[PDB]
Amino acid sequence: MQIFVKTLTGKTITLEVEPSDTIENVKAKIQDKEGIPPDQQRLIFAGKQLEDGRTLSDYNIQKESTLHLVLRLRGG
């Protein structure tokens, strides 16, 4: 299952994530692929806030699905 995480700026990257795998596992891979901490970027889909402790199938996230990302400005 290779989905496409699209950010606000307009960055859609192909990221593979199992449906059972929680959002943390996704932000996890996305964190090691882009360098964005799980608690630094907020993802949204179908008007639902993807919580760190939530599954994908719950938000009807299919393959190549466009997952909205929100990069939290101001780091450290």
Binding site: L8, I44, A46, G47, H68, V70, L71, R72, L73
Partner: peptide, 19 residues
């Protein structure tokens, strides 16, 4: 088809500088 509608608000909402 209001997926980007509400998201568009988050774009500028996150891009703050002077206000």
């Amino acid at each position: 088809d209001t997926q980007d509608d509400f998201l568009k608000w988050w774009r500028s909402e996150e891009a703050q500088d002077m206000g």
